[model samples]
Target: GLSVLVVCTGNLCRSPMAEIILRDKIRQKRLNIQVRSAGTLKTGKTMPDDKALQALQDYGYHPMVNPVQQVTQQDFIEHDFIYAMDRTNLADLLDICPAEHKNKLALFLSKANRQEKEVPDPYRRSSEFFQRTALLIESGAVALVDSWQEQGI
Candidate 1:
């Protein structure tokens, strides 16, 4: 089973939401993949921002949104796939990724959609913004998960 790592600017928001949504989808589909999330900055924080938590709760998911440190060499070696929320985050990952690991990193939305669009940062935005972003991530994640052909798993 492939291990997926979702990354964003800060684990407090987008990445945590993606992690929770992906986990729920995997459970619903009975897939065996492992899912986790992390941030691109070491903010020395350990809790999800209130808005992010509220946004997830509003979407009917109760995720343990804790701060995860920025990606490191170990992460590049450990994760089978790295999904970034935006191009900037993707670029940051790529900068540190070795040539062999380059192919393992990509924008999360690129899996289901052809266009490379950034999942906007909604840290300080209204609840509506977070809701919309969450929906987008959910849709993309579902599409990606559904695309997998479980031969026997």
Candidate 2:
């Protein structure tokens, strides 16, 4: 089984969204993988943003039941693949990563064909942006899994 982690500025938004989306993706394929997400900053958030939850519902994705948390070195050590929502989060993760796990940190879209290394933060953006970001995430997800499977991940 594969272990994956997603990262963003706050666990409230993009990272959590990707976490659920990717988990749902693997579930759909009945694949063996564990997915998780966290953020660089805590935002003192205990749960995902209300709009984020609603937006995910709109896309038929799984809802998060746990509170938000900050990323840690242990997370880096545990996950086989660690992805950041964007370049900034990528930098933040790299900074905190144990040197040996540094190479495991990469952009979430690294396996995708998208030009953007960062999935834009939608914390203050419109509800529509949440859906838009979902579009990008869900679209990239299939390709990500496919690529990993091809490489025997």
Candidate 3:
């Protein structure tokens, strides 16, 4: 099974949503994959933001995820894919990732639709922003898994 790590600035917002949505999609498709999420800045220990959780729940995903710390060297080596929400998160991961792990790092949305581009961080934004971001993540994640499956991996 391939493992994936979704990363964002804070686990409270975007990353966790992406993680849950991707997990749900993989489960629905019966694909062999592991999905997890982490933050870039360690905001100590925290749970997903209520708004973000609500948005995910509205999409039928249970709001049961706990916060996870920022990614470490071991995470980079362990996961087959490390997806970042935006350029900032991607750069942060690249700074800590070894050269051998570089191939695994990518902007989440870019992996799917080349024009769809980056998944923006919606922390402290309006509820609508969170909803839009989640939709974007869901679409991108599904496309990513589809492409990987098509490639027979």
Per-candidate TM vs. native? 0.91, 0.93, 0.93
Residues 1-153 of candidate 1: C-alpha lDDT, one tens digit per residue? 778898998787888888889998888877888888888877777776788778778878866554666777888889988899989888888878899889888788986774536788888899889888888888878877886644445
**Model 3 residue 105 lDDT score:** 90
**Clash totals for all models, in order?**
0, 1, 0
Report the error of model 1 at residue 16, Å: 0.6
Q: By summed lDDT, which 10 consecutive residues of candidate 1 come out lowest?
A: 144-153
lDDT of every predicted structure (CA atoms): 0.82, 0.81, 0.84
lDDT of 2 at 3: 91
User: Is candidate 1 or 3 superior in TM-score?
Assistant: 3
lDDT of 2 by residue, 3-102 (tens): 9888888898887788888888788788888888787886866888888888888977656556787888788778999888888888878767788878
RMSD values for the candidates in order, in angstroms, are 1.9, 1.5, 1.4
Off by over 4 Å in 1: 114-116, 150-153
Q: Write the per-residue lDDT of candidate 3 for residues 6-38, one digit (tens) a residue.
A: 999877788888888888888888999988999
